[PDB]
Design an enzyme around this catalytic site. Structure first.
Site, short mmCIF file in Angstrom:
data_model
loop_
_atom_site.label_atom_id
_atom_site.label_comp_id
_atom_site.label_asym_id
_atom_site.label_seq_id
_atom_site.Cartn_x
_atom_site.Cartn_y
_atom_site.Cartn_z
CG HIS A 181 -13.01 -6.82 35.17
ND1 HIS A 181 -12.86 -6.44 33.77
CD2 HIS A 181 -13.44 -8.21 35.24
CE1 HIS A 181 -13.37 -7.38 33.07
NE2 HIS A 181 -13.77 -8.60 33.72
CD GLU A 182 -13.32 -10.55 38.16
OE1 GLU A 182 -14.30 -11.03 37.85
OE2 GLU A 182 -12.13 -10.60 37.46
CG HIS A 185 -18.44 -9.42 35.54
ND1 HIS A 185 -18.88 -9.33 34.11
CD2 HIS A 185 -16.77 -9.76 35.56
CE1 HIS A 185 -17.68 -9.48 33.34
NE2 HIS A 185 -16.67 -9.65 34.16
CE1 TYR A 206 -18.53 -12.20 30.43
CE2 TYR A 206 -18.31 -14.35 30.27
CZ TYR A 206 -17.50 -13.27 30.62
OH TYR A 206 -16.40 -12.75 30.90
CD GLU A 250 -15.26 -9.50 30.32
OE1 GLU A 250 -14.02 -9.12 30.45
OE2 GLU A 250 -15.63 -10.25 31.20
CG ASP A 297 -13.38 -14.75 25.13
OD1 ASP A 297 -13.29 -15.41 26.35
OD2 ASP A 297 -13.12 -13.84 24.86
CG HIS A 341 -12.40 -12.05 28.09
ND1 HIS A 341 -13.02 -13.27 28.18
CD2 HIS A 341 -12.67 -11.57 29.50
CE1 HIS A 341 -13.63 -13.44 29.41
NE2 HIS A 341 -13.24 -12.19 30.39
C1 LIG Z 1 -9.72 -8.73 34.84
C2 LIG Z 1 -9.00 -9.95 34.47
C3 LIG Z 1 -7.90 -10.14 35.23
C4 LIG Z 1 -10.00 -11.34 34.87
C5 LIG Z 1 -11.20 -11.31 33.94
N1 LIG Z 1 -12.06 -12.52 34.37
P1 LIG Z 1 -13.76 -12.53 34.17
O1 LIG Z 1 -13.77 -11.89 32.91
O2 LIG Z 1 -14.36 -11.76 35.12
C6 LIG Z 1 -14.30 -14.31 34.06
N2 LIG Z 1 -15.54 -14.52 34.14
C7 LIG Z 1 -16.30 -15.34 33.38
O3 LIG Z 1 -15.87 -16.20 32.91
O4 LIG Z 1 -17.78 -15.22 33.98
C8 LIG Z 1 -18.34 -16.44 33.37
C9 LIG Z 1 -19.00 -17.21 34.68
C10 LIG Z 1 -18.10 -17.70 35.36
C11 LIG Z 1 -18.54 -18.36 36.47
C12 LIG Z 1 -19.89 -18.61 37.05
C13 LIG Z 1 -20.80 -17.68 36.16
C14 LIG Z 1 -20.43 -17.06 35.09
C15 LIG Z 1 -10.66 -11.82 32.59
O5 LIG Z 1 -10.51 -11.03 31.87
N3 LIG Z 1 -10.67 -13.03 32.49
C16 LIG Z 1 -10.08 -13.67 31.07
C17 LIG Z 1 -8.70 -14.03 31.35
N4 LIG Z 1 -7.89 -14.42 30.10
C18 LIG Z 1 -10.93 -14.92 30.58
O6 LIG Z 1 -11.69 -15.45 31.58
O7 LIG Z 1 -10.77 -15.38 29.61
ZN LIG Z 2 -14.70 -10.05 33.10
#
Ligand SMILES: CC(C)C[C@H](NP(=O)(O)CNC(=O)OCc1ccccc1)C(=O)N[C@@H](CN)C(=O)O
Ligand SMILES: [Zn+2]
Ligand SMILES: [Ca+2]
Ligand SMILES: [Ca+2]
Ligand SMILES: [Ca+2]
Ligand SMILES: [Ca+2]
EC number: 3.4.24.27
Length: 316
Positions: free
Chosen positions: A142-143, A146, A157, A166, A226, A231
């Site tokens: 997933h990461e 991105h 985003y 997402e 969010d 998400h």
């Molecule tokens: C698969 C999951 C276990 C982890 C997943 N993390 P992600 O989507 O990659 C969280 N990225 C983000 O905010 O990017 C935005 C960003 C962040 C930092 C710098 C630039 C841009 C998730 O579903 N998280 C939920 C956990 N309730 C959330 O963040 O609400």
């Molecule tokens: Zn994500």
């Protein structure tokens, strides 16, 4: 670092043993030279400065509890690289073998993981909501996905483009989980979520509503939390993707499944050839229809099933 390629052994977050590609130069480093321009794993040491220090180990054995999140971040990044290269002919996230960097032990009690624009970052969790998040192959993929999205379609985003962003990460996270073929499912994060609760996950693609996420456009979230529900509204697209692959009848609309491989081909082509930073759900439908048409032909079952699936979730 400059050194020679070596093979270490260690244990991941779930207690499983695996070999890891390392580099020897005085210490053994979590630096895999076998893939592109390298995969590098760093210790953030419970702080928020990034990346931290390239992971160094005296003996090339990684069985300590503190090692486990690093082992899995490093190993699962390798699996994800292999998926993109072998299945989609894509060389790392930028298509030109960019070095892949991850930091583990980020912050204290940190219940998340993210791509920060330049690298992957994994919390250890608080032991209640999450254990160290690199223990989930679907999370790691997933990461990294991105980064793929950011280099390709560039989906902003927030709101619908962000929910597509997402969903793309959940879809490819799941397809990487199936590629590795260890307990694969259509759930997200089950291996590291809620150690005290069996059988749950952070999201479900097969039934998003099990966790309160929408499974039909008419149930979309329209507020500001969010980033406009990125998400949450991802459930609408995740459900469509699940239906394309697996089939089903959803709100009375029947979808003939075409399987995971064709799902992945259609969505990879949509992501890399048709989507743009501001694409909305209707434009994703059009991109997936066009992609399936390119791959399989206008009169194909694959095209018909893409249309069925988006109809089933209320996206025209
Ligand atoms: C698969 C999951 C276990 C982890 C997943 N993390 P992600 O989507 O990659 C969280 N990225 C983000 O905010 O990017 C935005 C960003 C962040 C930092 C710098 C630039 C841009 C998730 O579903 N998280 C939920 C956990 N309730 C959330 O963040 O609400
Ligand atoms: Zn994500
Ligand atoms: Ca050691
Ligand atoms: Ca699984
Ligand atoms: Ca999963
Ligand atoms: Ca659980």
């Amino acid at each position: 670092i400059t050194g020679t390629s070596t093979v270490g052994v260690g244990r991941g977050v779930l207690g499983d043993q695996k070999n890891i590609n390392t580099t020897y130069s005085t210490y053994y480093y979590l630096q895999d030279n076998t893939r592109g321009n390298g995969i590098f794993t760093y210790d953030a040491k419970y702080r928020t400065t990034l990346p931290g220090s390239l992971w160094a180990d005296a003996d090339n054995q990684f069985f300590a509890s503190y090692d486990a999140p690093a082992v899995d971040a490093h190993y699962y990044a390798g699996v994800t690289y292999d998926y993109y290269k072998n299945v989609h002919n894509r060389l790392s996230y930028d298509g030109n073998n960019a070095a892949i960097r991850s930091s583990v032990h980020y912050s204290q009690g940190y219940n998340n993981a993210f791509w920060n624009g330049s690298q992957m970052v994994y919390g250890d969790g608080d032991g209640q909501t999450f254990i160290p998040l690199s223990g989930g192959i679907d999370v790691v993929a997933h990461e990294l996905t991105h980064a793929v999205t950011d280099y390709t379609a560039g989906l902003i985003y927030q709101n619908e483009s962000g929910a597509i962003n997402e969903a793309i990460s959940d879809i490819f996270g799941t397809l990487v989980e199936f590629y590795a073929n260890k307990n694969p499912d259509w759930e997200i994060g089950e291996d590291v979520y809620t150690p005290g609760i069996s059988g749950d996950s952070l999201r479900s693609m097969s039934d998003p509503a099990k966790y309160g996420d929408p499974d039909h456009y008419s149930k979309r979230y329209t507020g500001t939390q969010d980033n406009g529900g990125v998400h949450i509204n991802s459930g609408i697209i995740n459900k469509a993707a699940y239906l394309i692959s697996q089939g089903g009848t959803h709100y009375g609309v029947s979808v003939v499944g075409i399987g995971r491989d064709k799902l992945g081909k259609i969505f990879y082509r949509a992501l890399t050839q048709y989507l743009t930073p501001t694409s909305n759900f209707s434009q994703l439908r059009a991109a997936a229809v066009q992609s399936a048409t390119d791959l399989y032909g206008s009169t194909s079952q694959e095209v018909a099933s893409v249309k069925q699936a988006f109809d089933a979730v209320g996206v025209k």
